[PDB]
Amino acid sequence: EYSNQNNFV
């Protein structure tokens, strides 16, 4: 299982 999230302001 592979889970990913990213934010760029």
Side-chain angles (χ1 to χ4, degrees):
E1 182 175 19
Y2 181 100
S3 304
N4 187 48
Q5 200 278 326
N6 310 266
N7 292 310
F8 304 88
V9 195

